[PDB]
Structures are given as C-alpha cells and as structure tokens.
Coordinates of C-alpha atoms in Angstrom, one line a residue:
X1 CA 10.4 -3.7 -1.6
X2 CA 7.0 -2.2 -2.1
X3 CA 3.6 -3.9 -2.5
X4 CA 0.3 -2.9 -4.2
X5 CA -2.8 -2.9 -1.9
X6 CA -6.2 -1.4 -2.5
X7 CA -8.5 -0.6 0.4
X8 CA -11.9 1.2 0.4
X9 CA -11.6 1.7 -3.3
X10 CA -8.2 3.3 -2.9
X11 CA -4.9 1.9 -4.1
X12 CA -1.5 3.0 -2.6
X13 CA 2.1 1.9 -2.8
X14 CA 3.4 0.7 0.5
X15 CA 7.2 0.4 1.1
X16 CA 8.9 -1.2 4.1
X17 CA 11.5 1.1 5.7
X18 CA 11.8 4.1 8.0

C-alpha cells in the first residue's frame, strides 16, 4: 500500500505503516 508522489522535482515511494 504504497503511492508515487513527486515533490520539488523529486519522486519517492511512500508506504503507510510503522
């Protein structure tokens, strides 16, 4: 359960958890 978001010309994988 991860999403793909790009901010300030930077993309990173964010996963909901601990």
